[PDB]
């Protein structure tokens, strides 16, 4: 019935538009309407509770506090009732991290590795525009809460669904960013081609033209994506 999309991407580094959707399953009045988020690389929609646990926010009360900044808002908390249930099976960060690990991994893989895979996804794929380093799990939990929030605040006929065509939430990509997309994607082949001058060197071998041709090519046509 609803979906709460972010399209988070790093401003610099290498632009990874890794979409997180926070989906409210069931339409108004379908028995037990659950919320699930859709993590990148994780081939199944994870109950949002389980993510919070995998993010170290174990106890219901705590999780709900991250979502529902209002103890009287019994309507919203009552919407989540089945979420809390939907993630009942999982009660500690590792089981949670494992739950995710398993929906990102083949059945052969060992628990530690599995947990470790889910630990790296949450650290780098899940909401990467917040932080990609370590200690920032509360930072995501909170943001993810806020997502679930807004999603429900929309589901509760309390919010108008976002205007797709509002211009403030558009960006115009220009000479600068465009020539930087290619130049990133071309310097990355220059960083790759120079790498085939080390693995391949056992004992000045730089293609100027990869970039000259690449920029020059794109601009001579209108070939970007």
């Amino acid at each position: 019935s609803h979906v709460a999309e972010i399209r988070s991407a790093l401003e610099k580094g290498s632009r990874f538009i890794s979409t997180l959707q926070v989906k409210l399953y069931g339409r108004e009045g379908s028995s037990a309407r659950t919320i699930k988020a859709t993590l990148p690389y994780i081939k199944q929609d994870i109950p949002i509770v389980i993510i919070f646990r995998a993010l170290g926010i174990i106890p219901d009360g705590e999780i709900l506090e991250h979502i529902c900044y209002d103890v009287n808002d019994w309507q919203m908390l009552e919407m989540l009732k089945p979420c809390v249930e939907d993630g009942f099976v999982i009660q500690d960060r590792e089981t949670a991290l494992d739950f995710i690990g398993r929906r990102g991994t083949a059945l052969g893989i060992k628990k530690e590795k599995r947990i470790q895979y889910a630990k790296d996804i949450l650290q780098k794929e899940f909401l990467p525009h917040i932080t990609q380093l370590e200690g920032f799990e509360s930072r995501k939990a909170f943001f993810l809460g806020y997502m679930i929030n807004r999603l429900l605040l929309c589901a509760l006929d309390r919010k108008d669904q976002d205007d797709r065509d509002h211009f403030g939430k558009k960006r115009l990509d220009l000479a600068g960013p465009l020539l930087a997309q290619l130049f990133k994607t071309l310097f990355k082949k220059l960083t790759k081609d120079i790498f085939r001058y080390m693995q391949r060197t056992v004992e000045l071998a730089i293609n100027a033209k990869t970039i000259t041709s690449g920029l020059k090519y794109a601009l001579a046509t209108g070939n970007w994506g």
Partner: protein, 117 residues
Amino acid sequence: ETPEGQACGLVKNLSLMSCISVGTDPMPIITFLSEWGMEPLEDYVPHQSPDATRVFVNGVWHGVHRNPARLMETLRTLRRKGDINPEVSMIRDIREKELKIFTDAGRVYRPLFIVED
């Protein structure tokens, strides 16, 4: 000024005074924000402060701030000096408990006369 038919409304033109934001580092602002009483999100408890205006910056929830208008003033005044980059965009949604700051390039903006009391 839009071309008719197929491109109609899809190909647009900048009004004479639109420029497009060039893109600025949010480091100094996020730095100023916690210098200016922004509560870190790590150290944030809502059942404790539900009257908390949440500061976002280029989309990132950076934390919280009770008494935002006093943040908002400064933020505005800094930008109106030069000290925060002019192109930097700060919107407070009073009835949403949100103060979203924007520093990324691509934001189409235009100049206006400031009317202040």
